[PDB]
Structure formats: structure tokens, C-alpha cells
Amino acid sequence: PAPSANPAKIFIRRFFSAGVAKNVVSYSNVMAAQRAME
Amino acid sequence: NTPLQAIGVPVALYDALMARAIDSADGTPNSKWLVTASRDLDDGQAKEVKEGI
Numbered sequence: 001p002a003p004s005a006n007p008a009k010i011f012i013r014r015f016f017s018a019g020v021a022k023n024v025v026s027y028s029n030v031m032a033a034q035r036a037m038e
Numbered sequence: 039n040t041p042l043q044a045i046g047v048p049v050a051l052y053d054a055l056m057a058r059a060i061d062s063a064d065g066t067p068n069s070k071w072l073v074t075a076s077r078d079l080d081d082g083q084a085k086e087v088k089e090g091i
Contacts (some may be wrong), residue, residue, distance in 0.1 A: 038043055 075084050
């Protein structure tokens, strides 16, 4: 079964960096969803 | 999370419009026929013309 080797390593190489705990949504999006609730 | 969050603007606008309506209801003269005579009419038969009208 599970082969552990997916083709999404294209981004962790340089386009991203490991061990940083990046947030999931931009702060602008959070504020937009906030004021869109009023 | 209540509907009252998002209706401040419309309720304030409604109250503003209704206040305008009330104020203009009493305050606007409800008379017609703004009739005006001249400065040569012997004020004393101007009254006679007014009573005739």
C-alpha cells in the first residue's frame, strides 16, 4: 500500500521551508471574513 | 451572532426618513392661493377685495 512518495515535494524544496508552522489563512482574509459578518 | 448586528444602518436610515416626514407634515403651510395686491389700493378696499375672495 502506502508509498509515502507523492509529487507535492515540488514546493517544500525551496518554494517553502519545513518546520515553521505557517498559518493557514492570510490575515487580510481573516479581516475580510470578520467585517463581512457585519 | 444576531441579526441586530447588520441592521444598524437600515434602522437608522428608516428613523431619519420618518423624522423628516413628521417634521415636514406640520410646518409646511397648507394654504393655497397666495394672492397679492399692489401698493396702490387704498388699504381699506384691499380688505374689501380680501373679503370678496
